[PDB]
Amino acid sequence: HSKHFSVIGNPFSKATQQPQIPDGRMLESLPRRCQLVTEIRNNVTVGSNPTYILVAPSLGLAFQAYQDTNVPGGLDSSVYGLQNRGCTVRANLSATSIENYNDIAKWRIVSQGINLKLNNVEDENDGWYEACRFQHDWTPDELCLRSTENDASTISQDEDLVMGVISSSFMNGALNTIGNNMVEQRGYESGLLKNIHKRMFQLHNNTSAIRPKTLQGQFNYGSEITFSGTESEARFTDVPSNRQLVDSLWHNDYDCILIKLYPRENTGAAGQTGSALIVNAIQNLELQYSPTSDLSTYHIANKRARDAAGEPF
Amino acid sequence: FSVIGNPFSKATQQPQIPDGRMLESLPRRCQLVTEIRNNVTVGSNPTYILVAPSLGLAFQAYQDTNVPGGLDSSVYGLQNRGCTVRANLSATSIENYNDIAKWRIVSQGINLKLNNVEDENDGWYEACRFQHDWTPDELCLRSTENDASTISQDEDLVMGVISSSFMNGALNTIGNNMVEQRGYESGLLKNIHKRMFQLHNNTSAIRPKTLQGQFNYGSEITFSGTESEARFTDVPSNRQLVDSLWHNDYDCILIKLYPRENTGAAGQTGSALIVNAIQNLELQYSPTSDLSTYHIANKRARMVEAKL
Amino acid sequence: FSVIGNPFSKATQQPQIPDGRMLESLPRRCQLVTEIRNNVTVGSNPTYILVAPSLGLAFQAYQDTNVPGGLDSSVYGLQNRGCTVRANLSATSIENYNDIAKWRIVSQGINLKLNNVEDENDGWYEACRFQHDWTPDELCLRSTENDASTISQDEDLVMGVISSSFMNGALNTIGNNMVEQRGYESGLLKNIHKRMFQLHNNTSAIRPKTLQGQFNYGSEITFSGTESEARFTDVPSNRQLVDSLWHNDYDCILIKLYPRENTGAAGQTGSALIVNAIQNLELQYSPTSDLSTYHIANKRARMVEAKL
Amino acid sequence: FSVIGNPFSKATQQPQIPDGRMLESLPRRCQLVTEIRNNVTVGSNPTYILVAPSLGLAFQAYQDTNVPGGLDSSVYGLQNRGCTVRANLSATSIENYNDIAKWRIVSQGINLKLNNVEDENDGWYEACRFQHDWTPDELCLRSTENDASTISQDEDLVMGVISSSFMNGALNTIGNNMVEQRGYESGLLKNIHKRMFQLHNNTSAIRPKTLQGQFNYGSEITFSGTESEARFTDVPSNRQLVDSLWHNDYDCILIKLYPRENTGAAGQTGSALIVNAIQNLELQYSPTSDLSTYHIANKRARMVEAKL
Amino acid sequence: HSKHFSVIGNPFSKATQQPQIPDGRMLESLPRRCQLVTEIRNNVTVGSNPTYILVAPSLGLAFQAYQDTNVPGGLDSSVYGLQNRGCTVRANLSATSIENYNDIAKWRIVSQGINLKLNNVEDENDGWYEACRFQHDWTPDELCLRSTENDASTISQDEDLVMGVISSSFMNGALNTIGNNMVEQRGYESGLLKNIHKRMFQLHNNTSAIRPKTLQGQFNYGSEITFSGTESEARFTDVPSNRQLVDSLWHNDYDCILIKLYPRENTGAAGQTGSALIVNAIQNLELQYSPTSDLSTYHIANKRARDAAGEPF
Amino acid sequence: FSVIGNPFSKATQQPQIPDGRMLESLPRRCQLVTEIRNNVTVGSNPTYILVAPSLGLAFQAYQDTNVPGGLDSSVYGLQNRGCTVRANLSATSIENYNDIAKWRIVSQGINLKLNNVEDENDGWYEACRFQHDWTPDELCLRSTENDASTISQDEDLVMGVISSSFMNGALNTIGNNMVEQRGYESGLLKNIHKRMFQLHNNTSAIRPKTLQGQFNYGSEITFSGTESEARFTDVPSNRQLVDSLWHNDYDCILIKLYPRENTGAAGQTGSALIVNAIQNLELQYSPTSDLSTYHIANKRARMVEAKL
């Protein structure tokens, strides 16, 4: 069980391609390492206002970034989801349901984290950051469904989806409040971007008894889920069905990480095009699949074994 | 504790799960024995038995001679042992009249014996366990009477699957992919008697389910106008009901039967099976709510005798 | 083992008698807590609390404010714990509807606490245990309802003494000669809260009493026209009924009380006692005789489905 | 671990549950001390003290002199310790303005002391603990103000039982059958000062309840036009609110009181009880949602000073 | 490479769960063992006419049976396909194409075979059989698309499909001709059904250089594919598009096996309900997946290693 | 205990000073992070940062871009963490609204990081600690808002130095004799990031300072008519105030900066510094004095319900 402990806590760890939590709460589950690499750069429209990166325990979501250069259409944040990897739900608009097309019965997170590296030339390598972890009490009308495609079109039939926060949360909602009061948050850290590659930001569990969330094959929705006519976004009201859906897609046994960025401004002028971070998100999952699924046959017995934002990457 | 035991143990069985998740709990042994037989309607097509972690359901049998009216499966309930809910139609609710506050399963299983003469002992079977991502519209309320009439006042109910799951739903899909499932086995019916089929828990931290004293419902539960069944849509109220009567900390078992055909004639009357089903429960009871039989006397003394 | 234990003791309370005389027995704890007070008609005369090894009886109290209609004693029973018989008048029999096949007592007794204010806390008592040679004409049947109506169909019954025993019968005679009796004690009522009175067995080999499902009677049991009491003559049948409801392997307890007078006025309202009777039973049950609320399906599979 | 400890014990009082189920939690001790008395309208009927695992509620008392307007029970809350939710009527939501993300109870209970003079110190009580299978229509929201006005904006709320439960509902039914319940005790009120009543957990794996920052409601919560109470129907939303304010991993305590009568006159003014409720909580907090009194300066240095 | 040789030829072989042909023609492919168990019983309507079992090298098809008790609706044969196993195509009727939803780029058959066991009581255990292998020159109008569901409904959106032969081929087409002239076929064998469990019928390759077939993501079709209004069947005309589709789904580097059955008649009378065979088909495949696929990440390097119908099962 | 520790310890830090001089004290961690930049007005002359043992002052920075109106320095307060006093102008007093009875400092320090691109990373610095014989007319009250307007009602205040001390007062004299002071160091700004500057206590017996609930003042405190500052004369009242908010059991730190010049043009915008200041306090709190939010209920029971 040594390799499992190496991966547990430390997502950036090539110890085993089969990471599981050995607590006996998921007998014969299936590991899944999902990795994503991308570039985060603050866009021109945010100006000198701070930007953000949110790492949340949502299923299939690597992270969410506010006012970077990949924001689609009229939305102010980008979702970086892990698609075509067997750990996403999709939009069965014809049946008006959220379809569990991979047939995941139960799921939890073995570990999750990001590492960021500044790649600007040394004459443009300024900017700083703060980071914290927190255990916010989410309401569904603060959350939303985003197409993993992160594109500028309405959510269409069979579109892959992940749960994110509404973009305005960064501007005037919960995440703005946390970002304005970072120093009082747990695990507070601050530093320069030129050094941020030394850090590994991993999610932490708020309990030692992490129970998997459950999912139905189809989750039928009424008018409480409003699909945008323009954006790739669907919004919730705070009603029982949306609370059930949030429970099934947002694992509340883990805390979130928020990184607030004061980057070099992006204006368009010659040497003034922002701060570019190479990002390396990883989400290590434990799944139980339903027999109808393709990935059912790869199940493997899992038998019981006997507070700072960043760590030294 | 890792895995739940075998209810048909000649050895000694633990009355409860010794983990400290249900303090001062009481064990309830529920057992049903009955003969079942594949009916004539199903002809030469296979039949099915489903054992589910559903409170008070001994098993559900697809297309046996007991099927009521137009429904295509039978349910066998343990309502005589005090572990079912009933239908309170006047108050339009599911009533928890046995005062169960919390329940889980210590062990549950089934054992079948072929009761056929020597020259009619053909047939065979496949069996497996599975963890399925149930949607509520795949489940339903069935009367434990398993009779041909509508659900009426104070009818005992169990949660089972809509009969169509067996023919073109989830159970058919599993029924056709048995040999790839976990815990697969196959054999001849004349040998099935030496097989104890037991449910497996999918977690070692089994938390009890909670029941309300009354579970109220609106139009999302449709009671059938002729049959002893009520259907669910997939809405928040019905998910909560499914969460109270179906224990998703346990997998299900599907037995697929290829029985000797029953044409309703001598020599060809199907494969009679003696079924022994046990559901060992662990219960925490709420206070008795119906004292209609009790003699409740005023505990304060009278100042003076009623004589004066 | 030699002697039974204290039901109120908080020290390793045995649920059975470890003598091997009742194999696969079950325990049953039956407790009643209530307040009582001497009434006005008894005046400055003594009152009594009898604790007897009668099946289902917590205690009998002479001349308290609860005495029904024209009877002079109150019976307090444990009918709500399913340890009684009832009147089957339409069959003219005493019905053992709780299906008790055999019974004995594991422990029994009462604890009394004075519930008067400090300037009204006078009074004293004498207490003893004894082994009277009861005759069935000294005993009677009483409705546990303890009401001023006649015994009706299915009314719960306990065997107690006739009320006139306390006044001019065996209990009065014993009450007048308490120091000669075993276990004699006396004290002030304001200190009685410290006494855990408990029945004693007069043999270390306590054999269970037996009960029939029905005990038919003739004219030897006279039901009062107006009172909730039935009387006995001394004939073989009544002796046989006495033997099944009164365990004579145990001694009785008589508590004679000399309380503050109840005249009905302010400051002269008697002595209120909070009584805490307990009767712990060891039972061998007989199979459920009433299955009117069971579902009993035919255990043989139909040959063909009903819709054919 | 197995069972929670005694909040009144002066012996190594754990501030947390050492089970690892709430990492970086914080403790919160909430204590209320007050006097109560039975009122005149209840007369010679019993009164009740309920202690429940509801968030922020010290205890609920049936028919004491503090009952607000036309309600028959008083709620006593710990709002001053920041462990409550409040009414956000202008958003039609229940506001978790104290930013509690998750909570469980470490220990809870009450101690009662009789505060009558020695010539008025009569009365007695029965006490038990139980694990009722609550339905949301038996519960309600109550303003901790405990006043005779309607629930206003930002009014602090605790979840308690509807007052009619004590009279003709589940609590009355439990109150009539106390000896059947676990932990049964009885005694005189003049001795109740010796009892440290304490809640019990019904599982050794107590998982924290969760709270949202806002809990929006529709018509399923009816606010009284005249009283400081809001009522529930049994619908999915109310069940979800019940689950966040009522920790059902714990049992409730019912104390049934038979006190000296309050007729309003001299020497007949009831039984005064000094109540010492404590609720010890383990909390995981969520980041401060209200920074209206914070100073938030821009963290980026200006390029130039303002006076230029 | 010993386990690979054990599985190659011998499909019923628990030597390795990763069987591949080590000829170097599929570098870094992915094995797939697909297994099916069912019952074949001659139905009442075929009377005393012979029945058939066809084992063909079609993708995702275990075998096809003529006039058994599972024939759906008005069709005279049953398809037993391997569904929910990552090796099937489906019917994108909305886009009017045959969709390669698992994104298989290249595929071939490592081995394929069946074993049959009679399960009638000894007083009803008569009947005999003949078997042969052959290398028929197929025309597309002899083939067709069948829903793997083998049900009595029209092919609907996203229905799983396999290639089979048209049912009438057994009655008056190529398979009737082969069945009538079995003795002249290669590998001819004949026997009693009570002994047929001793035999293992495996497909054989007609070349030592087996080249994988290729598949597109979408295969668009015109009116040359006619979907039944009633049955779960789509028929071909002999046109270029249908020849391309047949090439992509029917591997012509292997021969077919045909078993002709003379069973105990099924009439309905008491002891006269046919011959019941427990069937254990296995198809061991070698696939190359396209990167978009879920099963892409499980690719494994495959480096070069250096005539009778039945064998002793 | 000899010397106070380093607030930026990767190791584990003592929450309090373990000497027994503040029993039942509570620790308060106060931290401020912000970017500062030398302004244009100061031109090529050096700038300064002062860290003082002043309650709630994170640091004071001479001539940075945040200077308000006509004042020549900025203050950075920790008023969000509850360790400052405020201005009660209606009662003409300094109000101790956080109810601090006694306070000292466990550890206090600062860490600066140069946030400048590679071709603008010039500059250097000298630093030292000093014990100065402060006179009150060298100190002043500053608004923590650090804004361009007069001090108004309930304004949070910290004690800092008059800005002129930096240019021609005590701090300039020290600023020019840095290399003779205790704990001198110098370096390049591009290297200052690896330097933890911490205050040193000048005694090992650190006694807490006391604050009044209200500190009244007369004309000896002059509030500025345009700026957010109040000046002191040297009179007995002002010495007592300086003794309550400035802890002379600790030395100060002066960092003298020779930054890259800021002309307000691209390429020449000064030396941006990320400042991390921590003041770890040890506090003894007085009882809460503002209960405007509390619900204070009468603890005495009503004789009769308000209903009658």
Residue numbers in the entry:
A (entry chain C3), E (entry chain C3): 60 to 365, 378 to 384
B (entry chain B2), C (entry chain A1), D (entry chain A1), F (entry chain B2): 64 to 371
What does the paper say about this structure?
Bacilladnaviruses is one of the major group of viruses infecting eukaryotic algae. They carry a circular ssDNA genome of ~6 kb, which is partially double stranded (~700 to 800 bp) and encodes three proteins; one coat protein, one replication-associated protein (Rep), and a third protein with unknown function. The capsid protein contains the widespread virus jelly-roll fold but has additional unique features; a third β-sheet and a long C-terminal tail.
The capsid was reconstructed by imposing icosahedral symmetry (I4) and using 33,507 particles to an overall resolution of 2.4 Å using the “gold standard” Fourier shell correlation (FSC) 0.143 criterion. The CtenDNAV-II capsid displays T = 3 symmetry, i.e., 180 capsid protein protomers assemble such that the asymmetric unit comprises 3 capsid subunits in 3 quasiequivalent positions termed A, B, and C. For subunit A and B, residues 64 to 371 were modeled, and for subunit C, residues 60 to 365 and 378 tp 384 were modeled. The A and B subunits were close to identical: the C terminus of the A and B subunits form long tails that end on the capsid surface around the 3- and 5-fold axes, respectively. Contrary to the long tail toward the capsid surface, the C terminus of the C subunit is directed toward the capsid interior. The N terminus of the C subunit has a small α-helix on the capsid interior that was not present in the other two subunits. For CtenDNAV-II, the two sheets are formed by strands BIDD’G and C″C’CHEF, respectively, thus containing three additional strands (D’, C,’ and C″) compared to the standard viral jelly-roll fold. In addition, a third antiparallel β-sheet with seven strands is intertwined within the jelly-roll, i.e., strands from the third sheet are formed by extensions of loops CD, EF, and GH of the jelly-roll. The unmodeled density in the subunit interface of CtenDNAV-II has a pyramidal to spherical shape and is surrounded by six arginine residues (R84 and R270) that resemble an octahedral coordination geometry. CtenDNAV-II is placed together with RNA viruses from families Nodaviridae, Alphatetraviridae, Carmotetraviridae, and Birnaviridae (Clade 1), thus corroborating the result from the DALI search as well as the previous HGT theory by Kazlauskas et al..
